Amino acid sequence: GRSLELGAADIQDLESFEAGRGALPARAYLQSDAPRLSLNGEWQFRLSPGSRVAPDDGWQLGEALNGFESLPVPSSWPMHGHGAPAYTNVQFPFAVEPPHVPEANPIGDHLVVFEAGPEFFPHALLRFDGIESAGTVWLNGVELGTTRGSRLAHEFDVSGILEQGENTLAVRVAQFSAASYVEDQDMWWLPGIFRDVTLQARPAAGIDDVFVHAGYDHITGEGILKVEASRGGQAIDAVVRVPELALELAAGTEVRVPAVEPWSAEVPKLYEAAVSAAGESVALQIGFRSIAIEDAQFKVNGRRILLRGVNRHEHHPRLGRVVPRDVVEAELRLMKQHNINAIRTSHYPPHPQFLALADQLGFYVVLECDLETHGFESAGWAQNPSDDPQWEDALVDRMRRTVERDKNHASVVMWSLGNQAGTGRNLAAMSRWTKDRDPSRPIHYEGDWSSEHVDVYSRMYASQAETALIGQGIEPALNDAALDARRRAMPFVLCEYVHAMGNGPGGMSEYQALFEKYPRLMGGFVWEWLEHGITVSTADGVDHYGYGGDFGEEVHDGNFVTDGLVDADRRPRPGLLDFKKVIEPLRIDVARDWTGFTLRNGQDFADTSAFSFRYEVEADGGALDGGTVDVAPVAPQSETVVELPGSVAALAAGLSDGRPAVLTVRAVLGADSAWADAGHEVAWGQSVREPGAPVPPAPVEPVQVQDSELTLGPVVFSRATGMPTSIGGVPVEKLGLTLWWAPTDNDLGREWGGADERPLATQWKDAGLNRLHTRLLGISANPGQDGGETLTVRTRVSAADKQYGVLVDYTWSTDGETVGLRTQVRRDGTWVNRGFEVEWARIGLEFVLGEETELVSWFGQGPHQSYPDTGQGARAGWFSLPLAKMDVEYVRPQECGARSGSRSAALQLGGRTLEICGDPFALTVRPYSQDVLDAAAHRPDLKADGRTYLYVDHALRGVGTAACGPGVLEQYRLKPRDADFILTLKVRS
Amino acid sequence: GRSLELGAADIQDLESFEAGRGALPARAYLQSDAPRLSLNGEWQFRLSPGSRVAPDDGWQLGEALNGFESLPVPSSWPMHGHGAPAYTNVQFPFAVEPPHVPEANPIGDHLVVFEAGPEFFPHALLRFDGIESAGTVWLNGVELGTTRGSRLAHEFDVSGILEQGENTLAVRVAQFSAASYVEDQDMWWLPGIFRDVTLQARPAAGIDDVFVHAGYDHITGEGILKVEASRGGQAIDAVVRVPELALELAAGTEVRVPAVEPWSAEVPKLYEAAVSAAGESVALQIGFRSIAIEDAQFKVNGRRILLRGVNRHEHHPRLGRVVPRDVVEAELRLMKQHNINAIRTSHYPPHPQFLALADQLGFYVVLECDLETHGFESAGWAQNPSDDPQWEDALVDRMRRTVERDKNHASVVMWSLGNQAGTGRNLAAMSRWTKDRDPSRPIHYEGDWSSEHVDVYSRMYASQAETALIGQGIEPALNDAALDARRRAMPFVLCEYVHAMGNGPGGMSEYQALFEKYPRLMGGFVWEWLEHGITVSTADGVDHYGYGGDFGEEVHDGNFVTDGLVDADRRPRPGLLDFKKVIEPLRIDVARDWTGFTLRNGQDFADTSAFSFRYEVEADGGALDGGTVDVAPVAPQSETVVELPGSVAALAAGLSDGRPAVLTVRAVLGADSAWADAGHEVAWGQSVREPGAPVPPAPVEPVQVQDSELTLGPVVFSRATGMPTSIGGVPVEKLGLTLWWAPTDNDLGREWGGADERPLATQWKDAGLNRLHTRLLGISANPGQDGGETLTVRTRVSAADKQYGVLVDYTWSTDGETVGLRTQVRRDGTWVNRGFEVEWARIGLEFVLGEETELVSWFGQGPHQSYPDTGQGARAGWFSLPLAKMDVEYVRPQECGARSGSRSAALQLGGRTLEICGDPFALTVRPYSQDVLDAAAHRPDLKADGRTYLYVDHALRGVGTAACGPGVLEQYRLKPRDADFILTLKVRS
Ligand SMILES: OC[C@H]1O[C@@H](O)[C@H](O)[C@@H](O)[C@H]1O
Ligand SMILES: OC[C@H]1O[C@@H](O)[C@H](O)[C@@H](O)[C@H]1O
Ligand SMILES: OC[C@H]1O[C@@H](O)[C@H](O)[C@@H](O)[C@H]1O
Ligand SMILES: OC[C@H]1O[C@@H](O)[C@H](O)[C@@H](O)[C@H]1O
Ligand code: NA
Ligand code: NA
Ligand code: NA
Ligand code: NA
């Protein structure tokens, strides 16, 4: 019969399996002297909820615009009130039935008027560097075409459509399209024209495309240069000038430069070049380097390299997918400042401006195509576009555009087909296309472990153990003997490892030792550089980051998008401070006798001439000595023993026994670089003269007994509970055993393997670890010394409904000045619950004091937190921080702020100071309780209550990376056990 | 050394394994002419948080009372502001380490001054009928003793301690003691002196104990009477008078009464008797009945009986464990009014006054000892007191006191050792003790399935299938051949079945048919009679019930305590209305031709003389005919065919085809009974002349097309969505498919068996059933009739991230007056998620109307809700209720209120009325959405939004009893399938 539905045609276009239509051939992004006009600025924007109600009212013509309001472009429009951001990880936010699209599909109509001078005639084009996800483009009312591939560039010919003077550009953007099925990255869904829009003139006798080939003969030191130039796809005559190298050559001819300085992330040497035809000149930066796979090793310029990498998404906490250039420059500088040398453009090509910065600052780049079909996995990959022939042209297009845009950049050392897209015919087609087009760069793809269509073997989150087996070449064989032979000849990369969500990542050091030991291991890229937090405010206007669910999403994945080394505003997390140290390119081992240090240059190409080597001896009262020592340049992968000045060793010999002192040797920048100023720290090592264990105070002065209180020097006990009620005028509200901490994001993740896959957080809750109860068994005084008396308080700790417990005995002693506390812990019964062994977070004490703390000082590791499998970046020394600065501003509050390896601590409580000494303990000080910390979903929920929560831990569990990847390694697990530890306390007024 | 802890002695007493000390021998509760004074009234009360701080300040003497305030006694003191109620099911609220007690142990000091006249001298006693959990008792400063067994009676001799005139009674009650380990019932923890306190004189030549033996010879009709009387444990001479039977006999001699009328729950004949010694007379009610197990059947007075039972806890929503006498009488009347004939005193003996009411109203009683160790189960029963020899005397005591108190009551037909206490030596000792003491009553205990120490085979929540196998005697054998032979000779009882939590219970009819078919099946007792809800109010003072967690509990079990047939205030839930019908003691099957009905007397002893048999024919406009028919008494377990007056059949023959009419036959009380008034309904049956399927309207008048709307008679469609936007001026805000409902408590329970034990609620959430999305595929008009046109709207329904869907096509038609809606549903793809088949809650439509509804009327089943496996109590007829009265006030809001079997419906929306007809559909009407219903944890969270949510379901799932016991039976499950159904709509103004 009849057909009455609306918008069927717009929707049928959105449901297209094809690439964009009407676009010029894909080419490089080129700096050209051709006239250009940026259309970035204030556009007009109208939002309709779906195609069926998007007006077809000739709005493209620019006149009589009702419903339109101002909107900046580039933009991610949900970041400007229009709709809301939405976060899913794997799950699609719409029903999975490709190529169909939901009825709720935000449609954004963009319109801008601009002036086209005569220099854009006769020929010109319009360039869009990114539209998420489907663009339709009209100029002065005529349709130029459509765009597909949200992070890829499209160029449309406007010759004979651009009119001199006023022009009107109209763009209809659909959030969802068939392309959404192939853009399922773990990140926010954010439609918009989110990258540059540019009018460019195309002069006659110009240059459309250039393909730089710049190799390096590491034996002769020769460069191998060929620069290809074309117009309309055909090779053209052009001249290539490289002044610094005294070169003038024809485009299209290979020459041998007698001697070039080769490009690497370490020494990113770049030669300025120009490719000139009659009507247009293109300016290039040329880095001479050759990539090769040899002996199951990934080599640049003849050397195996070590990738110290991160996964870099593009995200801004207020602008969405638009990352301003000053943020890009700052964050790339920040990466270099933390010894990073490699970037994976997870999981799509970056802004085109990124590539020149990577060339200049020096990163080995894995440039990744915009392709991810992860949400088909949950259905056994049924309908996976990667293996559906109908999607072949769309996916080859995506790969073509990815390669063509960035093929001229030395920093790109690998092409990646995409991410988490399964296996399939279209991936093979993308590989063959890339391999034919650009043999000079190995192909990467992790989704197909057989590695049939790639040149490197890539995995995500392989455990340290499996990595060690791969490093030795003894991983299990593939069933296919041919494929196994190929894959065993491949070097191995962790495209994602040590997931950096919340407190953590743990186990980074164990990976690094393998990277150093085994040449086949190329290194690894941390998942991920940044947290995708989005700024939002509450009533009082206090700012904080939002995550999945905080924007009304029907389906989401919560804080899983906040999984980074820096926050959305690029403030480092402790994991980055640790990472910087783990990947430091020099190793400095200070001799115990302070006569010198062993120095190993862990770089691949550079020597140590860029570094100044500094030493300082610090003591309780500050610096005793310091200076700089001169070090003959150490070659890459070599080592030497540097003598320290004799005054240092002599100072060590003169220290009275038990006086703590720390010798630190640092390698800093001898001069300003392009990524940091002179004096910036790159590497360091220490040797510590530990303080002698604190003398327990003689048990002098007998305990005083009263009706309800007991008194032992400065300590007052409740005779009912047997617990201290004040120490030296400091009110104590509670003292008890701790075995639990507020779960980290890692603790909320499933630990696969074994019959028990409950997250540790759930194991703890089931076991009652968060709700310990204490029963008093007895209190007794015993002869001490010369009248004095110790006080022993015996308790048992358990939880409601459990038969297992620990016996905890506190023996107190005092000489009137310092208080001696010995704690003994003994397992009672079998610590099994729900059929599995219970594990502990800690063995420690919680002191709850009835006064606030202004300042915390300690001798130990710092300044930032450290847990058994983290804190590589925490060095030995003396530290002091205001209470608030002891905390860590994770988006979801969780256990954090512990300072492991403390020998002494001092809390300033108003006018008094509480001092704690003893054998190594971890230190934590909070203005709120653990229950307040666990309950909080965002930082504003953390309310101070005027108390001080002081945690002193004899033992801590590790933090691992169980949110995604390995849990805590065996050596850092904490099974129930017996324990004993001494402390001394003292209050100064 | 020294020992400084406080309260060690009080705590060591609380940790005692022994029974109470200093108490008189256990005896019956006896109505005596001895002087008595109740000390119930306003006592003084002081609360301390534990033994170590409970003052030892001579408070027992009554002078200088600081910290004391007024408190009524009996009381559960947390119900009066002192502390808070706390609910755990299985889990103990304290660490499990018997006999030890937590430091947080509320200690309640009770004190009262009273006057003792001379009639309490020389000898007297003090009687406590219940103290939870540990009592210490002083009178005028001297310690009488202690109490253990919280629901058991203790009596202390006060001779020479009671002083003439003023006396001061002091009682220190500890909430927790070693006894708590054996009182772990699924209920609130509520300390207090919660039952009577009584001063009783003990005259010389009195009677301390009496033991009535009153058997019945069902062959001769003789009574067998022996009344034992004792003083100080020794048999004494007394005279027994039974006037009605012309008997005067000696105590201690067995006589044969020539003819007695025997006692049963159906005919609770009681003979008044007095047992008199010189100094005291005891008044008794004697019911002659004999209990016997024969041929694997439980028989009373020579007949197998059917138990129609409930589990009766003692709970009051504002007074806790104190249940006022008028509530006890009312609720027992209410039970009889719903055909219940049996009570299990779950899981402790009731108030002593209960036993006379049960004798008088008529219930077969399972009287259960106060014993439950359920919380040791989770540890493999390690340390279970039931098998720990140190607990033998305490547990034998409990059983002794239980039996001695109530052994004289005919209503007690079984003794139960306790509940969920595992297996063990002490249970065997309790059984042997009871068996020696009172052979006249079989022993019940469910915890030991081997049944070694019991006389009946008892289970909880055995499935209908397993019950059928037990009923046939073909359940699997025990390993022990001797024990198997014993158990197979036992009749079988479900001490708990068809858990009545929230919407439900389902599957009651399938159990009942087995009880009727198989003599070995004794029947069953529903878990439980009442919800243990506790009254609380919010800001505006609106009252509602609280459950676990609503009182600050650290560990609890939420609404699992609200699992009853009536609410805390004894308002019936729909499950009780269904239960009443399922267990109705007469079966009335009305003949299709309306000539008569088959009547089966399902009683065990009584005939049908107590019933008046009434008929009524009702039609659309009300009653057409009615009257009473006389029925010659039908013997128990017999049946007959009763003719109806010829006018009834003739009326059926005269009905024009399609005119609905309902013949109902009811058996009501011919005269007032002791539990209801004359006319009270006991049983009923119906025969319905169904209305003819509604004629679909001729598809006349063609559909009108506009830019954004389509019009088809009274219906206006949105051309974008293709859905109605108004019908006859009634705004329609949404129309779509439903497959999901707000989970019931049953849906939140694990369905054991199979690899999938996710609750159904979780299966639905994982599957996206609660978040369906609809895509429009096409809208088309088609030739109807004489110009007219149908309108077909094709849609697909799925959910985000899922590949499965349903195709839903709506074909609309109208003649200008009525609207015809045909809906077609077709499965698209395989409905599997997380590896398991998805099940649906329903196949229906949700109409969301933009106006409120005042009234709902329908022809179908009613007046209360009905689901496929419930609604036995809903009868056919015409019903009309205000919107609010369509809802069901479950404590936790959940799916409820559906009216299955509807043929027509009418919603009054202000001035207009919306009418729905069609083949059988279920009807639900709410002022709030399903998401609001699912989110709500208490009724105050249900906010009306001014809309009407109308649900019309072609198919519904059952509700089952999966919260505890069987899920939905196979025949009521709802697997994805294709479906089609027609409806007609019409708006009257
Ligand atoms: O012009 C349409 C097509 O032209 C091809 O030559 C080119 O490889 C593609 O980039 C595509 O855009
Ligand atoms: O390419 C084959 C691989 O595919 C992955 O998706 C899978 O998780 C691996 O176990 C491996 O089989
Ligand atoms: O008087 C103490 C004991 O006396 C026994 O004769 C009696 O069986 C028990 O009830 C117990 O109370
Ligand atoms: O008495 C033996 C029984 O004990 C129960 O606790 C158990 O759940 C049953 O499976 C049965 O073994
Ligand atoms: Na992914
Ligand atoms: Na938290
Ligand atoms: Na229980
Ligand atoms: Na709910």
From TrEMBL, chains A, B:
Domain Beta galactosidase small chain/: 711-986
Presence of the UniProt keyword Electron transport in the record: no
Pfam families xrefs: Bgal_small_N, Glyco_hydro_2_C, Glyco_hydro_2_N, LacZ_4
One GO cellular component term: beta-galactosidase complex
Entry binding sites for (S)-malate: 291, 293, 435
Claim: Amino-acid biosynthesis is one of the keywords in the record: no
InterPro entries membership: B-gal_small/dom_5, Bact_Beta-galactosidase, Beta-gal/glucu_dom_sf, Gal_mutarotase_sf_dom, Galactose-bd-like_sf, GH, GH-type_carb-bd, Glyco_hydro_2
Sites where the protein binds beta-D-galactose 5: 196, 325
Residues binding beta-D-galactose 3, per UniProt: 186, 419-420, 496, 964
Record's catalysed reaction(s): Hydrolysis of terminal non-reducing beta-D-galactose residues in beta-D-galactosides
Binding sites annotated in the UniProt record for beta-D-galactose 2: 186, 419-420, 460, 563
Positions bound to beta-D-fructose 2: 228, 230, 437
UniProt KW keywords: Glycosidase, Hydrolase
Family (UniProt): Belongs to the glycosyl hydrolase 2 family.
Identification of the protein by name: Beta-galactosidase
Source species: Arthrobacter sp. 32cB
Origin organism lineage: Bacteria, Bacillati, Actinomycetota, Actinomycetes, Micrococcales
